[PDB]
Structure 1
Amino acid sequence: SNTQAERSIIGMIDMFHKYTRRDDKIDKPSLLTMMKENFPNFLSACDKKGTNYLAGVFEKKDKNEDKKIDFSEFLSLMGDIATDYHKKSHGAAPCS
């Protein structure tokens, strides 16, 4: 009944919720688990370059330094992953 795009948005919201605690925010070890298990091919391309995408990702996205990733900060991170895929669809190197 929803379109593919609406379904995609809904699946992203479900993935966020999967990694939250009671406060509806993602802590650091859960963000790193989420990234390793849901973005392994993205990360694999970084590792080959010698980029550890992960060290510091949580701190770069936790703009307000509350030690949690809330939904607004999660969307920023999803945007950064999407930007790397957009750049490579235009022949940039993986993990730029």
Structure 2
Amino acid sequence: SNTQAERSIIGMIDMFHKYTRRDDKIDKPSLLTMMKENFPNFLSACDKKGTNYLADVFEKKDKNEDKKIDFSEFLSLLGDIATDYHKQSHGAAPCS
């Protein structure tokens, strides 16, 4: 009975919780793993452009520099990923 958009959003929460530790936050190695497992085609596109997304994603998204990715920071990362697919649909090359 949930819609597709609702299922999609709930899905990101459960994805998140696949990788958190007991503090409900994601550490650097867990985040790179989350990315390889859940966005391998996104990453591949970047690589083909000469961009290694995982070299700096943790440092870019760990805005408060506590060496963890919290939920708000996780959402911001999903935002960056969404934004690239949005740009592409408007014709930009991927990972622009």
Shorter-normalised TM-score: what interval? over 0.9
Bigger helix fraction? 2
Post-superposition offset of 1:54: 1.0
CA distance in 2, matches of 1:46, 1:5: 26
Which TM-score applies when normalising by structure 2? 0.98
Aligned to 1:45: 45
Post-superposition offset of 1:91: 1.0
CA distance in 1, matches of 2:76, 2:65: 15
Post-superposition offset of 1:73: 0.1
Note the alpha carbon deviations across 1:2-28, whole angstroms, 9 max, x for none.
111111000000000000011100000
Post-superposition offset of 1:37: 0.9
> Which 5+ residue runs of structure 1 have no aligned equivalent?
none
Identity among equivalent positions (%) equals: 97
In the TM superposition, structure 1's runs of 4+ consecutive aligned residues that sit over 6 Å from their partners are none
Post-superposition offset of 1:80: 0.2
> Which 5+ residue runs of structure 2 have no aligned equivalent?
none
Aligned length: 96
Post-superposition offset of 1:93: 0.3
Which TM-score applies when normalising by structure 1? 0.98
Post-superposition offset of 1:78: 0.1
